[PDB]
């Protein structure tokens, strides 16, 4: 209940989701995923995070996670409010009780 994410592309654009603590899986497969996304571009298991009160760490992803356009090494703590991408999955997160931007600007 410490973090909230928001999506910016596809079927789930505009939706915000409270991140559960512990291992957090974004994916298209309800049997393997905590946060189920329905875009055809999303893999069965697409993004795996480790979430706790201190922050959110990359565990695994279907392709490299880019943060502000730069690949993030596994285990790295992610930056709240930054532009985060895993292929079609475009998202950011903030601390509960903070504003989520209306739009993300994708770098390149």
mmCIF file of N, CA and C in Angstrom, residues 2-8 14-17 79-83 91-104:
data_model
loop_
_atom_site.group_PDB
_atom_site.id
_atom_site.type_symbol
_atom_site.label_atom_id
_atom_site.label_comp_id
_atom_site.label_asym_id
_atom_site.label_seq_id
_atom_site.Cartn_x
_atom_site.Cartn_y
_atom_site.Cartn_z
ATOM 1 N N UNK A 2 2.131 1.113 -0.321
ATOM 2 C CA UNK A 2 3.053 2.248 -0.330
ATOM 3 C C UNK A 2 3.163 2.936 -1.695
ATOM 4 N N UNK A 3 2.937 2.186 -2.774
ATOM 5 C CA UNK A 3 3.138 2.721 -4.119
ATOM 6 C C UNK A 3 1.946 2.517 -5.050
ATOM 7 N N UNK A 4 1.775 3.459 -5.968
ATOM 8 C CA UNK A 4 0.713 3.412 -6.964
ATOM 9 C C UNK A 4 1.329 3.629 -8.359
ATOM 10 N N UNK A 5 1.014 2.760 -9.314
ATOM 11 C CA UNK A 5 1.459 3.001 -10.684
ATOM 12 C C UNK A 5 0.321 3.450 -11.593
ATOM 13 N N UNK A 6 0.671 3.959 -12.770
ATOM 14 C CA UNK A 6 -0.309 4.399 -13.742
ATOM 15 C C UNK A 6 0.239 3.991 -15.104
ATOM 16 N N UNK A 7 -0.655 3.594 -16.012
ATOM 17 C CA UNK A 7 -0.266 3.191 -17.361
ATOM 18 C C UNK A 7 -0.575 4.315 -18.348
ATOM 19 N N UNK A 8 0.148 4.367 -19.462
ATOM 20 C CA UNK A 8 -0.025 5.483 -20.400
ATOM 21 C C UNK A 8 -0.284 5.111 -21.863
ATOM 22 N N UNK A 14 -4.442 5.340 -18.360
ATOM 23 C CA UNK A 14 -5.191 6.162 -17.422
ATOM 24 C C UNK A 14 -5.535 5.429 -16.136
ATOM 25 N N UNK A 15 -5.450 4.100 -16.153
ATOM 26 C CA UNK A 15 -5.758 3.296 -14.964
ATOM 27 C C UNK A 15 -4.625 3.375 -13.937
ATOM 28 N N UNK A 16 -4.966 3.528 -12.664
ATOM 29 C CA UNK A 16 -3.951 3.503 -11.621
ATOM 30 C C UNK A 16 -4.125 2.243 -10.803
ATOM 31 N N UNK A 17 -3.018 1.719 -10.303
ATOM 32 C CA UNK A 17 -3.057 0.460 -9.596
ATOM 33 C C UNK A 17 -2.147 0.509 -8.389
ATOM 34 N N UNK A 79 13.346 4.829 -9.925
ATOM 35 C CA UNK A 79 13.074 6.203 -9.525
ATOM 36 C C UNK A 79 11.597 6.556 -9.692
ATOM 37 N N UNK A 80 10.946 6.871 -8.581
ATOM 38 C CA UNK A 80 9.564 7.331 -8.583
ATOM 39 C C UNK A 80 9.379 8.449 -9.598
ATOM 40 N N UNK A 81 8.257 8.416 -10.321
ATOM 41 C CA UNK A 81 7.893 9.479 -11.250
ATOM 42 C C UNK A 81 8.617 9.502 -12.597
ATOM 43 N N UNK A 82 9.582 8.609 -12.786
ATOM 44 C CA UNK A 82 10.332 8.568 -14.037
ATOM 45 C C UNK A 82 9.576 7.814 -15.127
ATOM 46 N N UNK A 83 9.973 8.058 -16.368
ATOM 47 C CA UNK A 83 9.430 7.346 -17.507
ATOM 48 C C UNK A 83 10.017 5.935 -17.567
ATOM 49 N N UNK A 91 4.853 3.157 -18.227
ATOM 50 C CA UNK A 91 4.300 3.368 -16.897
ATOM 51 C C UNK A 91 5.217 4.242 -16.020
ATOM 52 N N UNK A 92 4.669 4.715 -14.909
ATOM 53 C CA UNK A 92 5.496 5.262 -13.844
ATOM 54 C C UNK A 92 4.801 4.925 -12.526
ATOM 55 N N UNK A 93 5.448 5.231 -11.410
ATOM 56 C CA UNK A 93 4.835 5.020 -10.106
ATOM 57 C C UNK A 93 5.234 6.167 -9.172
ATOM 58 N N UNK A 94 4.410 6.417 -8.165
ATOM 59 C CA UNK A 94 4.781 7.362 -7.112
ATOM 60 C C UNK A 94 4.372 6.814 -5.750
ATOM 61 N N UNK A 95 4.879 7.448 -4.695
ATOM 62 C CA UNK A 95 4.462 7.148 -3.328
ATOM 63 C C UNK A 95 2.970 7.416 -3.174
ATOM 64 N N UNK A 96 2.297 6.611 -2.359
ATOM 65 C CA UNK A 96 0.876 6.838 -2.129
ATOM 66 C C UNK A 96 0.699 8.255 -1.588
ATOM 67 N N UNK A 97 -0.283 8.972 -2.121
ATOM 68 C CA UNK A 97 -0.524 10.342 -1.708
ATOM 69 C C UNK A 97 0.273 11.376 -2.483
ATOM 70 N N UNK A 98 0.805 10.981 -3.635
ATOM 71 C CA UNK A 98 1.471 11.918 -4.538
ATOM 72 C C UNK A 98 0.756 11.953 -5.888
ATOM 73 N N UNK A 99 0.974 13.035 -6.660
ATOM 74 C CA UNK A 99 0.359 13.207 -7.979
ATOM 75 C C UNK A 99 1.056 12.353 -9.034
ATOM 76 N N UNK A 100 0.263 11.730 -9.905
ATOM 77 C CA UNK A 100 0.781 11.011 -11.067
ATOM 78 C C UNK A 100 0.660 11.914 -12.287
ATOM 79 N N UNK A 101 1.733 12.012 -13.087
ATOM 80 C CA UNK A 101 1.664 12.944 -14.217
ATOM 81 C C UNK A 101 0.561 12.534 -15.187
ATOM 82 N N UNK A 102 -0.018 13.501 -15.890
ATOM 83 C CA UNK A 102 -1.093 13.213 -16.842
ATOM 84 C C UNK A 102 -0.539 12.505 -18.071
ATOM 85 N N UNK A 103 0.746 12.719 -18.317
ATOM 86 C CA UNK A 103 1.380 12.240 -19.527
ATOM 87 C C UNK A 103 2.842 11.964 -19.228
ATOM 88 N N UNK A 104 3.420 11.010 -19.954
ATOM 89 C CA UNK A 104 4.848 10.754 -19.875
ATOM 90 C C UNK A 104 5.474 11.169 -21.190
#
